[PDB]
Amino acid sequence: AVYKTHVEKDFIAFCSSTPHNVSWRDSTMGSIFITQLITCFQKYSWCCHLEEVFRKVQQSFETPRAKAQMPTIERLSMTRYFYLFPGN
Amino acid sequence: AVYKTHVEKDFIAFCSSTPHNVSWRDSTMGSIFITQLITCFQKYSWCCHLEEVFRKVQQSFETPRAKAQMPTIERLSMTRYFYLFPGN
Amino acid sequence: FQGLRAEVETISKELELLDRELCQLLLEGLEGVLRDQLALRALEEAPLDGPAGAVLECLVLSSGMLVPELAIPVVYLLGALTMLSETQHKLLAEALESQTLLGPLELVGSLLEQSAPGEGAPAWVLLDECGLELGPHVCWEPQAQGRMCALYASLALLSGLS
């Protein structure tokens, strides 16, 4: 049989910086974006879905310690919440 | 004194269709996207923030009857959740 | 020619929306319908199996009902294929299996544009089955216009699935 579906669906992109803007990375520490993303995943993955974790990342980027950057979400096609359930 | 802030922040765009795709509109009923968004706001504004309401919209667009559409979120710069609190 | 190309693109654009696996199963079924004209004569009366049975499985639902958004493009392709002979049909599937539909489609489009009104060459074979005088040879006889226009649609629709 054949049924109807969408072409694009369930997409989510997390970019390190707003459009037309610079993303930062430290030689000794790697990149601030990845470092914060890993920290937020370690702390909030067991109780917050992927999108909620991305907010915790952006919350950490409100006030700018030194360099100022804001990770943005784009082409969000998800129709459901994606809980990772670490350990399951 | 003067302090640092971001150039772009607290933005959120809700488009009626995925990129490269068509949005539909009925002469007698208006547009499917706006009708569903208005219905989700009437039903979920008092308890769900703006982004959670947009998910309820996309859930209503998951399985497609006849023509298929998926509203997408783009350039999401919000660092907090925006509750509208209708009536307050 | 411009109105003909637009009439072709109005269906070629709607056949790009068919799935990749569905395009391959449709291409496989049509290449099978080639060998057996028993499947061709049953389109006007139209579960079944075989080459046309495989094509039938591409355009039906769980209840077996036709999808008009997908059946009409197939009806238009078969309508342009009925104006051609079985020799042209078999040479078209030869170009299908070789997966080199860019050359002949480009030449037919370049000819079709100019005409506003050799031996051992498939194109010549193709043009000899159309009804042209072969031997440049810009001389064009209008008695083969419809089959060439149908050939162009028979070429571009397949490139829309390529």
Binding site: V2 | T5, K9, T18, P19, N21, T35, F82 | -
Partner: protein, 173 residues
């Protein structure tokens, strides 16, 4: 109808989710503004009949959310840009906490079409122009405040449907 949030849950959320939610101005001393742009009639494009239903619906909805709704209809790219910069410069946003931008017209991937748009004569407002207008450089009264841009413009001529193995009374924007 639009359901309302009880006073209890509003204040409980403000207590237990203070740093996670956007602040709200006092209902007594608040001036929330929203803007709607909708092009319905064109000279070279099919008419977007029925959009009036969407205009009133969004306007009434935003009014239920306590927003003063400005309406602009049938504008060129220049007029749309001018209307957006005029809305961004209005001083009531200093006493506001958020804003809504409801755009309804034909469009492409790059942006939204005007009234006199054509393939040979492109009249298009870019999406990037909107973010450029309302960023923290050009609009300072909406700093650290939510900015919701709800658009309805088709971004391509291709349908967004496929077919996988196992009504119709609407126009296209």
């Amino acid at each position: 109808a639009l359901k309302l949030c009880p006073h209890e849950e509003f204040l409980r959320l403000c207590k237990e989710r203070a740093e996670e939610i956007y602040p709200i101005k006092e209902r007594n001393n608040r001036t929330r503004l929203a803007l709607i742009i909708c092009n319905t009639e064109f000279d070279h494009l099919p008419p977007r009949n029925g959009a009036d239903f969407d205009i009133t619906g969004m306007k009434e909805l935003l009014e239920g959310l306590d927003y003063s709704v400005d309406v602009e209809e049938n504008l060129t790219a220049r007029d749309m840009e001018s209307a957006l910069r005029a809305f961004a410069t209005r001083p009531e946003h200093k006493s506001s906490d958020s804003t809504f931008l409801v755009l309804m017209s034909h469009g492409i991937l790059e942006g939204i079409c005007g009234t006199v748009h054509d393939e040979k004569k492109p009249d298009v407002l870019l999406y990037d122009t909107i973010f450029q207008i309302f960023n923290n450089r050009n609009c300072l009264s909406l700093k650290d405040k939510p900015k919701v841009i709800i658009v309805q413009a088709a971004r391509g001529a291709n349908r967004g449907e496929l077919w996988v193995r196992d009504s119709e009374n609407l126009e296209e924007d």
